[PDB]
Amino acid sequence: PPLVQVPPPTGNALCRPEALAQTQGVDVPYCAVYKQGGAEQLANGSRRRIIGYFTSWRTGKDGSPAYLASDIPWSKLTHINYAFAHVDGSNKLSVNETAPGNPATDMSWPGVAGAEMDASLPYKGHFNLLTQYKRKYPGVKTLISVGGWAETGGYFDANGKRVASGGFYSMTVNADGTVNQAGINAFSDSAVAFLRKYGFDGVDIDFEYPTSMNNAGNPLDWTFSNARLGSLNKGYVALLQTLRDRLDRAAAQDGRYYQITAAVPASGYLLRGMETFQGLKYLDFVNVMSYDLHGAWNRFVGPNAALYDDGKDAELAFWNVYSTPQYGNIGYLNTDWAYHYYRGGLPASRVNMGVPYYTRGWKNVSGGSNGLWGSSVGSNCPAGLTECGDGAVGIDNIWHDLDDSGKEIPGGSNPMWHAKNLEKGLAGSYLAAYGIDPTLPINQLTGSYQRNYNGALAAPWLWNAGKKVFLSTEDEQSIAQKAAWIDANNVGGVMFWELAGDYDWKAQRNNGQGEYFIGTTLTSLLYNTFSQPPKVSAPTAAIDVGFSLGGFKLGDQNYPINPKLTIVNRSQTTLPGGTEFQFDVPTSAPANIADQSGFGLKVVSAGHSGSNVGGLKGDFNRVSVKLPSWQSLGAGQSVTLDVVYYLPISGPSHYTVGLNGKTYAIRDEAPYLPYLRVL
């Protein structure tokens, strides 16, 4: 059949990342950051992204250990995310740059070698140092992260009090449930101005979370989030599409490229309320928050960031996930599952998986095996929680937050250097600097912290049998195991929270006796692995047929997941009955996807079968559905069918249309192939 010829891509279009949505007609300068074919030009000779979160609040001004921009391992990273900007009362991106003494732009560190201010920049603070060091390391990108858990829905004032402004929720969705175009425009324009002003290379959206699951947000945000559940997906897609548009236009004007990234949830629960993550097409890449999968907000004691399911996750067992036939023995609270979820709508090159450089932990743990998959129920829950685990405290919780009364909030949160000292039987000479009285019982080292490791989970932890304390850790053994998995799956890279938690042995500390402290062991392991060779070694025509899943219920009602699939014929040909549509569904969902409309939709190629212990065994389950023999799809017309699947997916992707003996790609995915207009 004759096809319609399309002009081939030229110039910058030859460097567009695979599947990234470009702003039509705008000369976006992709080749400034990407290679031909769309792979990223990465700093320091690395094969993988190595993305470190830098937190703004470790300035050392209160006497606690500082971690400054000059302490960053610039020669071993590819990207640095600055945490956090927020959405202010005028819906603009803000770091309180105009507040006297603010750490971003109005702070200095006299006498600290390497932290000297460049007098030629019209700002001081962290940003001054970031600008300076980027000159020495010109390939390293900086991005401004916006939101996070505490400031997704509000922001802190000068007195440390939180203003419940609504943040992302009110900026993206009006109180009446419609998308807030004015707010999204103000924010997007402000992001462009911010990038231009401070020399950032991109914006990292850390909206926690645009999900329709009830009570999923920070409890402090529920009056905003719960009122918007049905609208948050549309609001988030509008935010990302508009941000993409404004940054693409700015990039074309400035002759340099601006990235949009997002910190995105690993939780299958959160994702159940996020439709198919339609917004992925706007993102240069995602940073998957494959950590805080378990923690003392509930009683289920286990790894913070398991790589794999082991069939024994105590939380999943409690909810009957392993035993329900429909779930096909897929357990989802793990890094591998989350990665495979995001491949539904992204190539591997645009996904980076997160790891923690910090601990979470419980005390008074019962059951389990050396605490693993045990139980720890707590009392006097943190504000907003109606149940909690018994979070570890004192010497087991040195990176705690404080409540309004100035009291430590339990949770077993520590930098990994402190966890390494506990393992060694060292209390840490820095305790007093954190305002921790080392003479108090809860702040003394009692019992023995025994390191455990589970290779099925790629998870280390400390178990203190005397205190019944379980601290989930991350160290060289688990990083090496995850790094192997990254390389073998050719994943885009690795993200970590946070730089200040990485460690080294410091022989001179502790009166010359030595202890662990701030360092670069884990980042160095990642870099050394990814900058050297790995340890281990299509349709020619298209048709304009469109596919989309929609009609999702509110998240709490989305069991099982049964959206409507709409197929639209935008060719000038009638698709005869028997025409076959295929597409890839990520293996995050069991390979039992079906339709409820009598179409006979089924998996024709299973990338994964059986339990996912030891990891999912492939990327995609390819699905086929045919028009019934008697039913055509006319030019310009649509047909819908109800589908059902059992765990969240993004995408789908990689569509083909099987028409009169020939297989076509679709123009939405393959815009430069010659295409079928008439047949």
Instruction: List residues binding Cs ion (CB under 5 A).
Output: 116, 118, 317, 320, 322-323, 448, 497, 537, 598, 605, 607, 613-614, 620, 622
Cis? peptide before 84, omega within 30° of 0:
yes
* Nearest to Cs ion of 605, 660 (CB atom): 605
Closest CA to 12 of 252, 202, 271, 198: 252
Question: Cα 313 to the chain's mean position, in Å?
Answer: 22
In this structure, are residues 363 and 389 in contact, taking their beta carbons and an 8 Å threshold? no
Radius of gyration of the chain (CA): 25
Q: Please give the structure tokens belonging to residue 77.
A: 């990273």
CA distances from 380 to 383, 385, 406, 558 (A): 9, 9, 15, 32
Q: Which residues pair with 451 in a beta bridge?
A: 462
Q: Is the dihedral of CA 548, 553, 555, 556 positive or negative?
A: negative
* Nearest to Cs ion of 341, 675 (CB atom): 341
Q: Distance between CA 124 and CA 97 in Å, rounded?
A: 10
Q: DSSP label at 277?
A: -
Gaps in the chain (C to N over 2.5 angstroms) fall after 537
* Nearest to Cs ion of 299, 622 (CB atom): 622
Amino acid letter for position 94? S
Cis? peptide before 151, omega within 30° of 0:
no
Q: Which residues pair with 638 in a beta bridge?
A: 568
Q: Distance between CA 491 and CA 335 in Å, rounded?
A: 12
Collect all residues with Cβ–Cβ distance below 8 Å to 417 and sequence separation of at least 6.
501, 502, 503, 504, 516, 517, 518, 519
* Nearest to Cs ion of 320, 629 (CB atom): 320
* Nearest to Cs ion of 148, 492 (CB atom): 148
φ, ψ for residue 639, nearest 5 deg = -135, 145
* Nearest to Cs ion of 208, 544 (CB atom): 208
Report in angstroms how near the CB of residue 191 gets to Cs ion at its nearest. Answer: 21
* Nearest to Cs ion of 90, 369 (CB atom): 369
Report in angstroms how near the CB of residue 595 gets to Cs ion at its nearest. Answer: 9
Report in angstroms how near the CB of residue 195 gets to Cs ion at its nearest. Answer: 23
Q: Distance between CA 108 and CA 100 in Å, rounded?
A: 12
Count the alpha carbons within 13 Å of 507 in the hemisphere toward its beta carbon. 0
CB atoms within 10 A of CB 227: 16
* Nearest to Cs ion of 320, 380 (CB atom): 320
- H-helix or E-strand spanning residue 517: strand 515-518
* Nearest to Cs ion of 155, 620 (CB atom): 620
Q: Distance between CA 184 and CA 202 in Å, rounded?
A: 17
Furthest CA-CA distance within the chain: 85
* Nearest to Cs ion of 189, 487 (CB atom): 487
* Nearest to Cs ion of 254, 580 (CB atom): 580
Report in angstroms how near the CB of residue 449 gets to Cs ion at its nearest. Answer: 5
* Nearest to Cs ion of 313, 544 (CB atom): 313
* Nearest to Cs ion of 4, 488 (CB atom): 488
Strands (E), 345-476: 351-356, 360-362, 450-454, 459-464, 469-472
Residue 533: Cβ-neighbour burial (10 angstroms; 0-12, 13-18, 19+)? exposed
Q: Distance between CA 363 and CA 377 in Å, rounded?
A: 9
Closest CA to 491 of 287, 288, 351: 351
CB atoms within 10 A of CB 198: 21
